[PDB]
Assembly symmetry: C2
């Protein structure tokens, strides 16, 4: 029952967020992961305009 | 080369963050996923003190 529900959050929903996520945690040096996610997309959101 | 680097961000690093993440996106109704992550852990962080 919980598997079919996860069919939406595959590589099309949280992927755009997890993509850069691991790219930063790959170094395994999260001085603060609890707050990292907060400032992670907070600043990444205002990435200027192409 | 990128696989060994992902050995750290398995179910022990971003899991605590993805755990409640899917629990909310499971409904597939993210009015704003880009900002959701920001307020997702921002408020979840101050979850009172056990």
């Amino acid at each position: 029952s919980l598997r079919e529900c996860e069919l939406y959050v595959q590589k099309h929903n949280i992927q755009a967020l997890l993509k850069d996520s691991i790219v930063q945690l790959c170094t395994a040096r999260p001085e603060r992961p609890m707050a990292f996610l907060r400032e992670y997309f907070e600043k990444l959101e205002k990435e200027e305009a192409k």
